[PDB]
Structure formats: C-alpha cells, structure tokens
Amino acid sequence: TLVCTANRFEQPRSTVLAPTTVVTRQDIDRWQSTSVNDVLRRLPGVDITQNGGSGQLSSIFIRGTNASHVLVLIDGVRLNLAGVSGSADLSQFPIALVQRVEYIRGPRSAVYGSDAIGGVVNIITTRDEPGTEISAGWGSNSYQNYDVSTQQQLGDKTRVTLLGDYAHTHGYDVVAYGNTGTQAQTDNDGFLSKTLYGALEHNFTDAWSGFVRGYGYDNRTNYDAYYSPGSPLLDTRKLYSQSWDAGLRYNGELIKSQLITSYSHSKDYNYDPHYGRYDSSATLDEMKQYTVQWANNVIVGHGSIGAGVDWQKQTTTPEDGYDQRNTGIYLTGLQQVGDFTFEGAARSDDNSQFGRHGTWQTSAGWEFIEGYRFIASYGTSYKAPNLGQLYGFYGNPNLDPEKSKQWEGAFEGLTAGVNWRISGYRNDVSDLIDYDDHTLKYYNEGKARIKGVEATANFDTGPLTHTVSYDYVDARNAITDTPLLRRAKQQVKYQLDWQLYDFDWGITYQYLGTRYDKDYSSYPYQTVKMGGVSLWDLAVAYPVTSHLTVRGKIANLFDKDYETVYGYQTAGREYTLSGSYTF
Ligand code: CNC
Ligand SMILES: CCCCCCCCOCCOCCOCCOCCO
Ligand SMILES: CCCCCCCCOCCOCCOCCOCCO
Ligand SMILES: CCCCCCCCOCCOCCOCCOCCO
Ligand SMILES: CCCCCCCCOCCOCCOCCOCCO
Ligand SMILES: CCCCCCCCOCCOCCOCCOCCO
Ligand SMILES: CCCCCCCCOCCOCCOCCOCCO
Ligand SMILES: *SCC1=CC(C)(C)N(O)C1(C)C
Ligand SMILES: [Ca+2]
Ligand SMILES: [Ca+2]
Ligand SMILES: [Ca+2]
C-alpha cells in the first residue's frame, strides 16, 4: 500500500524504514469513530489525554514527547493553531473530513521542519470515490449527526467534490475538579460542530494536474472554569476556521513535481455567554497562515532523490511579536542495493526570530533472510519557540529551538502468516523552554530522556483478523529523573475483526497504564498516581441493502469510570446508531 508522507511523494510502505501506520476511510467507518482522537488513540506509540469528552481539549503525546512535539499536517500543511500554546487540539478537527491518516513515527524535521519530533500525523481530506452519500446517527447524551457528500465528474478531466456535516452533542458534566474556582459547574458540557468542504481536481494532461480546495468549520464547546462571584466565567469557546489550498502536480515516468499554495485563517473566542464574545472579558486568539511549498523527486538508480523549498508566514491578531516567517530547504534520498535499503533527509531552516537551524536523519535496513529485516536509524529534530514563550508576560524573545536526538533499532518479520515488528528507541530532548523562577523569564534549559519500545503484529486466525500493539515509554526529566506528567508508561491495544453472515463485527480493547498528574485543588500542587484501566468497545455493521448500511456501537462497554487528566470526567458507556445510503 502507498504512502506519500515520508518524503512528500508516493512510495511503497516497505520502502519507508521508519514505523508507519495508515488508516483508511474504510477503517474509520467500521470503527464508527466520531472524532480524530478516537482514530488516533488506537495506533502505535500514541497517548491521548483529554480534559473532558467530545469537543474539550485533547493533547497527543507521541512516543513520550510533549504535546507540541508532534507535527500534525492537514493534507501536508501544518495545522493552523491560533493559540499561543504549542499544541494542537484535535478535538476540534471534524472527523467528517478525515479520508486517510498517514502516521510516521520518529523524527522528520529533516523534511518538514519544526514540530516533527515524536513523529508526524498527516490527515488527508481527499477521497477518490464517485457517487453521493447521505448519512446520520443518534446516540447517548443527545448525540446527533447528519452528513451529505458527493463526488462527481463535471465533464472530461474535471472532478467536483462537496461535503457538509452537522454534529452535535449535549455531553455530560466534565467536572474539572481543582480548576473550578470557588464553586463547581454541574452543567453538561456539550459540543456543536458544522463543517463545509469543497474541492476541484483537473487534468491538463495525463501528467499535469491541478486542484483547488477549501473547507471550514464553525465549532462551539462548553467547558468548566474558574468561578469567582460577580466575575465573568469564561466557560464557552467559539472556534471558526477556514483553509484554502491550490496546487499543481507533475507525475512523470521518472520526474515528479509539486507546487502547493495554502491559506488558513482561524478565530477562536472564549467567553461567558451572559453579555459575551464581544465584550472585554471575552478572549480572542486569531491567526492567518500562508504556505508555499515546491518539491521535486526523481527516480534514479534503485530508488530516488528529491529536494524542496518551503515557505511559511503566520500572522496573529493583537506590541512585540504578531508576525513570523520561516523558509526551509531540504534534500531526501533512498536507495536499494542487494538486501540493503538506505534512506536519508537533511534540511536547513531559516526563521525570522531564531534564524538558522539544521537537522538530518538516516536509516539503514538489512533483509538478512527473506521476509526478515533489521533497521537502524538516527535523526535530530526541533521545535520552534511559541509566541507566548517569546513575547508573553514571561517572554524571552531570544529563545532557541528545543532540540532532539533520536536513535532506534528494529527487527521486523513475517513468520507463519504473522507480520510483526519490534523497535527500541531513545530520544534525548534538550534546550527545553522552561520558566525560570529567579528571573521571571523563559529560558532554554530543560532536558528529557525518553526510552521506549514498540511491538506490533497482525495476523488472521480463521475468519478473524487480529491487529495488536504494545508500547513501553519511560519519559523522564533527565536532570531530576522524575517521570514526565500525563504520559501512560505502557499501553496495550487490540482490535479483533470478523464477518459472520453479513454482520461485520469489531471489538476494540485498550489498556491505559499508570500515569501521573498534578492535583490542582490545593497549592503547592501535588503529583498524584492514576491507576490504570482496561476499556472495551463493540461495533456492528450490516448491509441492509446494497445501498444502505446500518451500524451500532457501544463505547466503553463495561461502564468504566476513569480519567486521563486528573479531575476531568471521561465518557462512560455510550451507544451510537447510524446509517449510510449510498447511490
Ligand atoms: C496551565 C494552563 C492550563 N490550561 Co489553559 C488555561 N487557563 N492554559 C494553561 C497555560 C498553558 C501554558 C503552560 N503550559 O503554562 C496557559 C496560561 C497558556 C493557558 C492558556 C489557555 N488555556 C485556556 C483554556 C480555556 C483552558 N486551559 C486549560 C487547558 C488549562 C489546563 C487545565 C488542566 N489541564 O488541568 C491548565 C491549568 C494546565 C495544563 C497542564 O498542566 N498541562 C500539563 C502538560 C504536561 O500537559 P499538556 O497536555 O502538554 O498541556 C498543555 C496544554 O494544556 C496547553 N494548553 C493549555 N491550555 C490550553 C488551551 C487550549 C485551547 C489549547 C489548544 C492548549 C492549551 O499547554 C500545556 C503544556 O504545554 C483548560 C482545560 C482549563 C479549564 N478546565 O477551564 C481550558 C481549556 C478548556 C477547553 N476544553 O476548551 C485558554 C483558552 C484561556 C483563555 N480563555 O485565554 C488559553 C488558550 C491557550 C491556547 N493555546 O489556545
Ligand atoms: C545521494 C545524495 C543524497 C542523499 C540525501 C540524504 C542525506 C542524509 O545524510 C545521510 C548520511 O548517511 C550516510 C551515507 O549512507 C546512507 C545514506 O543514505 C543516502 C540516501 O540514499
Ligand atoms: C547532508 C548531510 C548532513 C550531515 C550533517 C552531519 C554532521 C553535522 O556536524 C555535526 C553536528 O554539529 C555541528 C558541529 O560539529 C562540530 C562541533 O565541534 C566544535 C564545537 O565547539
Ligand atoms: C540541497 C539542500 C541542502 C540542505 C542541507 C541542510 C544541512 C542540515 O544541517 C545538518 C547539520 O546541522 C548542524 C550543523 O549546522 C550548523 C551550521 O554550520 C555552518 C557554520 O559553520
Ligand atoms: C529477529 C527475529 C529472528 C528471526 C529468526 C528467523 C530466522 C529464520 O527464518 C525462518 C526460516 O524459515 C523457516 C520457516 O519454515 C519454512 C516454510 O516453508 C514452507 C514451504 O515449503
Ligand atoms: C533490537 C530490538 C529492540 C527491542 C528490545 C526490547 C527488549 C529490551 O531488552 C533490553 C532491556 O531494555 C532496557 C530498558 O528498555 C528500554 C530501552 O529502550 C531502548 C532505548 O535505549
Ligand atoms: C515482542 C517481543 C518478542 C519478539 C517479538 C515478537 C513480535 C511481537 O509481536 C507481538 C507484540 O505484541 C506483544 C509483545 O509483548 C511483549 C513485548 O515486550 C517487550 C518489552 O520490553
Ligand atoms: S501524502 C503527501 C500529500 C498529501 C496531500 C496534501 C494530499 N498532497 O497533495 C501530497 C501528495 C503532497
Ligand atoms: Ca441541542
Ligand atoms: Ca459542567
Ligand atoms: Ca460549563
């Protein structure tokens, strides 16, 4: 199966030495995932925490690295984060738009620049699947979904794609114990999300193609906050975002090329709805992001070489700060010689605040017996300082990037019908941007050491398909040697799939290991141990006719009460019932 996230161009997965996962739309439909979080949580090396349930902030820790230490791409282009903190909030990205996820673990700054430390998550929005679908669902806590979608030819050489989605839930009380001020707020904390999307693809020739693509979503999230009597309670968020992409591609026999241009704008309010949103006490974060990427790649020898140039501008609304520019130039290559595979990338970034930083990576693999291979890898990567850190209340505008070195060694194989891989990796992160008590100022100074193991396998027993991973992550502050907070030390993930009669069943197990968080209810904030838990889901689909599929899910089958952030209640048992008429 193909990926194009490792070097921006289509290559076979067996050719990508770094561990790699691909989720298709078929997978997402079977899982009946109603968020990206639920898709992602299921994959190797991914640890998701949430401050609530649907629509509330979630963070991703890939292989023990900080939330901001993952690169999240939407069709190849950095996800627009308005915030001034460094981390994506995937709660907000509508699942309705996800047609494929390519997820590559290990460093990749040497291709994409900043953030690609633990790995890269590329969420792709383009499906090739003609016809038109209507779909819907209902479920627990007044969850309700509606969706219409069409892909149709507009004559020779042109495709229009349109989609509209409404999702809605009333949720449950997230509680937010310790974060709630003088009182608690017992309300249900719900989520409303509406998406619209349209694209056009065109073939000028068999080799040349162009595209124009735009989409937007308008999201409201209730949450719970610090209450102080007679004082505004900011406990509602309205996030608006839009993205527009145009591009041109050449797909020659040997030569491949792409020029992609992009514009994102997000507006992100937070407010007390009693006299609010447009009122002093309401907060507003806003960013516009422009991107221009040109890449080339040519087949040579037994493998390939490519190069690109990458440009990005981020402007934010109201010194000092407000406008940032980055330019990167990189090289990639790949070669197969006998039973050996060699792979590499190197990049030089030039950023308007820190200037120049270079990164590089290299992998070798050896197929020492047919179907069995050893792989060694090394790579450096980096994260740019955020606007809060640079220009905030505690700002230091002369910050340098956070730096990572990673090493990784893997055995993969095919044995008795079972495809399996096991990897050990070490990731030394340094120059971490820390607040410094004695100087009231951020500074590059912290260190972290992550030591991890990833084990995967998939096989079939009869009509049953098994897909299983185990993650070990020892993430620590390397100076003090204490565990980093909010990261599960071990996870076990298991999906069991089968078809009997025309019923398509899916069972999902996950163990979430021991994790540590701060209790915010009493100052000085104590670190506490969260115990760890098993969770099950059960999913059914049935093709009622050739046009109509109907589906049911029970998420968290045993009604298991747990938290991934101390004090924030998770879902409990939920039912979902949905349908799709295709035609
Ligand atoms: C400390 C903190 C927290 N924050 Co702030 C607060 N007040 N926050 C901050 C600070 C983070 C910077 C820092 N690291 O010191 C600070 C002051 C910048 C901040 C800012 C904001 N925060 C905000 C809010 C509303 C919230 N924050 C919490 C996440 C609320 C947290 C409540 C809680 N979780 O207990 C919180 C108390 C602790 C997070 C933590 O300890 N992480 C530990 C770390 C190891 O885990 P982590 O997953 O990597 O956490 C990261 C994120 O929390 C990110 N971040 C923090 N807040 C947000 C909010 C958003 C929307 C996003 C995308 C990211 C963040 O920074 C953290 C570390 O880098 C929140 C859940 C508190 C609550 N229960 O009301 C709430 C989000 C509610 C929701 N589900 O939408 C702001 C919107 C405040 C405002 N109205 O302007 C604002 C938005 C930031 C953005 N980037 O968009
Ligand atoms: C053939 C020139 C293009 C190489 C691009 C990647 C450079 C990254 O540095 C790799 C250093 O690795 C040691 C040399 O042997 C393995 C590298 O693999 C080269 C990719 O074909
Ligand atoms: C395209 C290939 C890129 C390969 C880069 C690998 C080598 C990079 O050099 C080492 C990294 O650090 C740079 C400085 O090295 C010497 C430092 O010693 C003196 C410091 O006081
Ligand atoms: C065709 C594009 C070439 C891009 C190659 C980028 C090389 C990336 O750097 C690798 C090593 O980075 C660390 C050392 O760099 C510091 C700069 O040194 C120059 C001053 O002595
Ligand atoms: C890193 C894990 C160590 C891998 C050890 C495997 C080394 C030998 O590989 C397997 C050799 O194949 C034997 C399996 O049986 C052959 C089946 O042939 C049936 C058709 O006649
Ligand atoms: C080459 C296969 C890699 C998988 C090794 C798993 C078995 C581990 O046994 C050795 C003991 O490991 C010590 C601590 O484990 C975490 C270390 O991870 C590697 C980073 O240095
Ligand atoms: C897995 C270790 C032994 C050799 C590889 C077997 C292939 C792995 O596939 C199964 C992976 O799923 C479960 C593995 O659990 C054991 C991993 O423990 C190693 C911890 O250091
Ligand atoms: S996989 C790389 C990729 C994603 C998407 C944005 C759909 N693209 O146009 C490319 C092929 C660059
Ligand atoms: Ca309603
Ligand atoms: Ca509430
Ligand atoms: Ca609330």
Curated annotation (Swiss-Prot):
It comes from Escherichia coli (strain K12). This is Vitamin B12 transporter BtuB. Induction: Constitutively expressed. Primary control of btuB expression by cobalamin occurs at the level of translation initiation. One of its GO terms (molecular function) is porin activity. The chain crosses the membrane at residues 132-139, 143-152, 158-169, 191-201, 206-222, 237-251, 253-270, 283-299, 302-311, 322-338, 340-350, 354-369, 372-386, 403-412, 418-427, 442-459, 463-478, 486-498, 504-519, 527-541, 554-565, 571-583. Keywords: Calcium, Cell outer membrane, Ion transport, Membrane, Metal-binding, Porin, Receptor, Signal, TonB box, Transmembrane, Transmembrane beta strand, Transport. It is a multi-pass membrane protein. Gene3D superfamilies: TonB-dependent receptor, beta-barrel domain, TonB-dependent receptor, plug domain. Residues 140-142, 170-190, 223-236, 271-282, 312-321, 351-353, 387-402, 428-441, 479-485, 520-526, 566-570 are extracellular. Residues 12-126 form the TBDR plug domain. Belongs to the TonB-dependent receptor family. BtuB (TC 1.B.14.3.1) subfamily. Residues 129-583 form the TBDR beta-barrel domain. A motif (TonB C-terminal box) lies at residues 566-583. Changing residue 2 to P: Inactivates uptake. One of its GO terms (cellular component) is transmembrane transporter complex. Disruption phenotype: No longer takes up colicins E1 and E3; colicin K uptake does not change.
